[PDB]
Amino acid sequence: STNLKDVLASLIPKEQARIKTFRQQHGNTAVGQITVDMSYGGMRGMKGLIYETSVLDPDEGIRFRGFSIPECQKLLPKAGGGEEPLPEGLFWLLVTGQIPTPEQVSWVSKEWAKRAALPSHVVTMLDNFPTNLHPMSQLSAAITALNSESNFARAYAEGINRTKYWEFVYEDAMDLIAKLPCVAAKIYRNLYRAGSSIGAIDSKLDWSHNFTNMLGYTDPQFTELMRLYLTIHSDHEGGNVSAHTSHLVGSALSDPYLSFAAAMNGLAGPLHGLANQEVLLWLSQLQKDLGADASDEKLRDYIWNTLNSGRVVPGYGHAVLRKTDPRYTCQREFALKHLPSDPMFKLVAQLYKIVPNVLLEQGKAKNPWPNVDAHSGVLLQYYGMTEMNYYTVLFGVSRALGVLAQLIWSRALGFPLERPKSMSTAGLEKLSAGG
Amino acid sequence: STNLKDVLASLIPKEQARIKTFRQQHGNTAVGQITVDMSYGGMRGMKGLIYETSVLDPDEGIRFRGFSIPECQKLLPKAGGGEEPLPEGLFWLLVTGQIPTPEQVSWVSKEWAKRAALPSHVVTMLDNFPTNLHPMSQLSAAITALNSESNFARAYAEGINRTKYWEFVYEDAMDLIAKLPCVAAKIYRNLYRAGSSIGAIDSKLDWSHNFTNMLGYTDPQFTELMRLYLTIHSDHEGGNVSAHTSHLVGSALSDPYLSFAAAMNGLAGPLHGLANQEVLLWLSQLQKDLGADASDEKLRDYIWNTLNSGRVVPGYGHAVLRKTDPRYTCQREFALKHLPSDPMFKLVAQLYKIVPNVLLEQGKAKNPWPNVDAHSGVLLQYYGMTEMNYYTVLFGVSRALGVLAQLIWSRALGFPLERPKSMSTAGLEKLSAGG
Ligand SMILES: CC(C)(COP(=O)(O)OP(=O)(O)OC[C@H]1O[C@@H](n2cnc3c(N)ncnc32)[C@H](O)[C@@H]1OP(=O)(O)O)[C@@H](O)C(=O)NCCC(=O)NCCCC(=O)O
Ligand SMILES: CC(C)(COP(=O)(O)OP(=O)(O)OC[C@H]1O[C@@H](n2cnc3c(N)ncnc32)[C@H](O)[C@@H]1OP(=O)(O)O)[C@@H](O)C(=O)NCCC(=O)NCCCC(=O)O
Ligand SMILES: O=C([O-])CC(=O)C(=O)O
Ligand SMILES: O=C([O-])CC(=O)C(=O)O
């Protein structure tokens, strides 16, 4: 009865026509200009990609198909007896643009339980990895190795006509999302619970719940945290490193497994998703140097020392946002509800009063406000997940939802190879005169 | 006496100042505009990145630090008794902008022989990979797994000041280049010469020669082919998928191993470097359907059938080039010198007379001329390297030179996070009015 693939079959042709006519009328309309500073500046400020699933406003923050986080919290189906949105529903919304029914949501949950199975070569590789190999590296290498199972790769090799690419992309997308929690849980267990097993998928539970059971957590509030975490980390428009990387790579017709693994190597950068890990490590050194209950003057000194040493303060700043990330606020609210007296949470709250002021004073950051990474691990730590080097993997699992949602659309719409022109400093000086 | 690291130490500060002042004068100067069609079109035509090592002219083809291929052939140091340029020299030129001496070239060769060593976890992983796992996937997963050895990753974790990033990037770059041929040869042997060993590095040979010895080839002309192949595939300005991917990923401070592995997943796409493999497979089906000596009319029919089936003709077309790729010409010339009567070569030559005309007739391709991939495998096949699924790995090994050369510079120059703004179709329609 419910079948997202059939729903997409109807939606594709209409969007295709809509875009066709618009481009007919406005393809040559200019939307902006390119300046020297933007080229040297990592395209900061350049409108460069079409990405359908979410759009970020610099002041208001992210919108998923037009809905803000608070709206998602309110509109998306929850677990029975739950308060947090199920990521399955968010996936539905991103892919279709429509809020799903709980019946639609449960089908996604069953579909994902049904497709979760790892091939042995992958299992063996994970099991043979050394404990000093970072969790993100183990995750990316496993996803890359799963490409032997790609249906898009196989169909492409068979010569399928380009109009059908989306269909195979959708299958690999659904299968990769289904398998991600098993890959992730397996790395968790091998590294931190050696000799134990992830167990089996219960076709009757939501994806976050099967994930937390494979991780070994029983707290019901932890399951709630997971549902929220996985929903909010899902997508952040297309120009963020991980999403842009999946987009660019997939544009060459690399399969979804290869596109997602490349994205993960981008998420593992300290200026991107690895910040979630870095925040915790900075905080632990904080509490170690200054010890648990610090004074404001002492926190400032600590912050200044980081800045003075040629390092960034993790968890603050943003390439597009210019105000406090609603994702940080949404986490703060969860903390205030569930772990209001945790000392680490209290520390994170105190830095909110300090850090922005120091950054402002330093005068370099364009956005002195906190971003999502400043508040994520604090939550995790409270529930017993103290392995900070593993935090980015969870962001990785979440991010698959948004990037894979968009990837289906890129191929449905026929987006071509992403290939901008580059320039050398010498060539550019000549183009202008020099300086 | 020779030490590239000391040479770069002097060059950095001067380039830094040069760029600083230029941006002072022209940072706000507009270099182009962005249109709707460019956003929907994979940034085709957008000047979007600064990339120093090479620049591609749409009519003339690639220039490496200002030199064309013919000039490199003529200027770069050759092996004793050789005719083809040594890739070590090309690496020197890209990194420094200056043509190296043969003494400088030999130091690079020794440096790379000295740093070539694989850690056991990597060896074990390769040895346990199934034979159905594509060679590019095995290569990318191994490079990702080598990141446990990263010096940049380690220094970053220790808190190094940002001004010194380049120094660590340079070390990981030199080490990754040194190890690449061992990773690559090991996949070659495991897959196609099961039970044999890659052997050891001879500190006295050039990098291409140690590579061909690990692959198991003795023909001296094969060694020459390898030197040319590895030099020409080295870099192709910054907006090509693989280079852009390394650039974007490295912009987040991910280490060179993670940045290069993500690039490789982009090179493995059929519209990018995998075309080299695809050309051979298309050709083999050709000769199989039509059998060895075909008539022109028959080749045309074969070509039209591919086009009519919703597929591309591999090896033809380009996102920027608008004339025949000098890299294809440079290969043709090698063929004419060394294997002029090979039937496959003859077939490739015949398609040169046919394909462009059919593409023109079809009227879709903007560039109906051949690209580098149309002539690479033909050369390989003649020397006995008939494993077409492995061809992209060789391109991968070559490409490390250009992208890693640039990566050092990106960090030396302090390029920030690559983060453009994205837009949805809906948002864009509104920005304009709609259509
Ligand atoms: C996120 C970001 C990389 C954005 O970069 P960008 O758009 O270039 O920031 P910007 O325009 O404000 O940078 C201007 C200057 O302020 C500095 N600055 C910005 N944020 C800073 C911070 N948190 N700490 C210290 N300095 C900072 C920049 O590094 C830059 O300095 P230089 O001119 O000397 O290079 C940056 O704010 C940063 O480094 N933040 C800390 C890392 C972090 O929290 N990353 C997580 C982001 C969310 C995610 O992806 O998960
Ligand atoms: C290389 C490239 C992806 C460039 O793409 P792009 O810049 O979009 O080409 P373009 O502007 O000429 O495309 C216009 C149209 O011509 C079509 N076309 C272009 N090259 C074609 C080819 N070789 N065979 C069939 N159709 C082709 C395009 O796919 C596009 O069709 P649609 O409008 O229906 O989408 C394209 O020429 C192609 O697909 N070539 C075949 C694959 C190939 O050889 N790749 C290797 C490139 C070199 C490398 O990276 O190693
Ligand atoms: O938006 C970006 O640049 C980074 C970010 O917060 C994300 O990807 O979640
Ligand atoms: O220039 C590009 O777009 C593709 C290409 O030929 C390469 O990367 O060698």
Helix and strand numbers (H, E) in chain B are 20, 6
What ligand 3 atom has the least distance to the C-alpha of A321?
Answer: 1
Residues of B designated catalytic:
272, 318, 373
Question: What is the helix, strand, coil percentage profile of chain A, to 5?
Answer: 65, 5, 30
Enumerate the residues of chain A whose CB falls inside 8 A of the CB of residue B49.
Answer: 39, 43, 420, 422-423
Per-residue CA distances from A75 to A70, A155, A237, B311 (Å): 9, 38, 20, 43
CA–CA dist B433, B435 (Å, integer): 7
Is the Cβ–Cβ distance between A46 and A38 less than 8 Å? yes
What ranges make up the beta strands (E) of B313-356?
A: none
CA A420 to centroid of ligand 4, rounded, Å? 11
Token output for B280: 């051979």
Angle, vertex CA A370, rays to CA A296 and CA A289, nearest 5: 40
Residue B11 CB less than 6 A away from ligand 2: no
SS3 assignment, position B17: helix
Residues across chain B = 435
Residue A273 CB less than 6 A away from ligand 1: yes
CA–CA dist A211, A88 (Å, integer): 13
User: What phi and psi values does residue B396 have, to the nearest 5 degrees?
Assistant: -60, -50
In the numeric block, the tokens 């000041």 are attached to B161
Positions at the binding site of A:
327, 399, 419
B interface mutation test: which of A152, A254, A260, A411 has the most B CBs within 10 A? A254
CA–CA dist A214, A198 (Å, integer): 5
Question: Which of these, B4, B234, B206, lies nearest to B96 by C-alpha position?
Answer: B4
Number of neighbouring beta carbons within 10 Å of residue B203 = 12
Per-residue CA distances from A275 to A115, B259, B406 (Å): 31, 17, 25
* CB within 8 Å: A251 and B271: yes
Residue A240 CB less than 6 A away from ligand 3: yes
Per-residue CA distances from B117 to B114, B187, B393, B397 (Å): 8, 15, 19, 16
| Annotated active-site residue in A272, A293, A325, A338 | A272
Is the Cβ–Cβ distance between A286 and A302 less than 8 Å? yes
Question: Which of these, A94, A155, A149, A115, lies nearest to A400 by C-alpha position?
Answer: A94
CA B236 to centroid of ligand 4, rounded, Å? 6
> Parallel, antiparallel, or unpaired: how do β-strands A54-57 and A47-50 relate?
unpaired
Residue B421 CB less than 6 A away from ligand 3: no
Which residues on adjacent β-strands are paired with residue B345?
Answer: none
CA–CA dist A83, A23 (Å, integer): 43
Pick from A36, A48, A243: CB nearest B29: A36
What ligand 4 atom has the least distance to the C-alpha of B319?
Answer: 3
Question: Which of these, B405, B415, B54, lies nearest to A39 by C-alpha position?
Answer: B415
SS3 assignment, position B117: coil
Which residues on adjacent β-strands are paired with residue A32?
Answer: B34
Helix and strand numbers (H, E) in chain A are 20, 6
Strands across the sheet containing A67-68: A54-57, A61-64, A67-68
The residue contributing the CA closest to ligand 3 atom 7 is A236
Q: Give A183: exposed, middle or buried? Use CB within 10 Å, 0-12, 13-18, 19+.
A: buried
- CB neighbour list of residue A18: distance below 8 Å, 6 or more residues apart: B425
Token output for B147: 């990141």
Enumerate the residues of chain B whose CB falls inside 8 A of the CB of residue A253.
Answer: 269-271, 274
Give me the amino acid identity at A48.
G
Is the Cβ–Cβ distance between B415 and B160 less than 8 Å? no
Number of neighbouring beta carbons within 10 Å of residue B18 = 15
* CB within 8 Å: B423 and A161: no
B29 CA to centre of own chain:
32
Residue of B nearest to A119 (CA): B130
Write down the experimental method used for this entry: X-ray
Helix A135-145 to helix A165-192 angle (10° resolution) is 140
Question: Which of these, A180, A178, A154, lies nearest to A165 by C-alpha position?
Answer: A154
The conformation of residue A316, written as its DSSP 8-state character, comes to B
* CB within 8 Å: A39 and B48: yes
| Mutation pick for ligand 3 pocket among A236, A329, A373, A395 (CB with most ligand atoms within 8 Å) | A236
Angle, vertex CA B241, rays to CA B236 and CA B246, nearest 5: 90
Is the Cβ–Cβ distance between B260 and B142 less than 8 Å? no
Question: Which of these, B231, B247, B288, B227, lies nearest to B48 by C-alpha position?
Answer: B247
Residues across chain A = 435
CA–CA dist A228, A239 (Å, integer): 23
> Parallel, antiparallel, or unpaired: how do β-strands A67-68 and A54-57 relate?
unpaired
Domains of chain A: 1-274+390-421 (1.10.580.10), 275-389 (1.10.230.10)
> Parallel, antiparallel, or unpaired: how do β-strands B54-57 and B61-64 relate?
antiparallel
Distance from CA of B108 to the nearest CA of A (A): 25
Tell me whether residue A373 is one of the annotated catalytic residues: yes
CA torsion angle for A257, A260, A266, A271 (degrees, to 10)? -150
Residue B43 CB less than 6 A away from ligand 2: no
Number of neighbouring beta carbons within 10 Å of residue B134 = 23
Enumerate the residues of chain B whose CB falls inside 8 A of the CB of residue A319.
Answer: 417, 419
In the numeric block, the tokens 């990785």 are attached to A396
Please report which helix (H) or strand (E) contains residue A155, including its range.
helix A151-158
Q: Which ligand is nearest to the CA of A268?
A: 1
Enumerate the residues of chain B whose CB falls inside 8 A of the CB of residue A433.
Answer: 26
B154 CA to centre of own chain:
27
A interface mutation test: which of B29, B147, B312, B421 has the most A CBs within 10 A? B421
| Annotated active-site residue in A175, A318, A325, A375 | A318
CA B365 to centroid of ligand 2, rounded, Å? 6
The conformation of residue A98, written as its DSSP 8-state character, comes to S
CA–CA dist B412, A262 (Å, integer): 24
Residue of B nearest to A63 (CA): B424
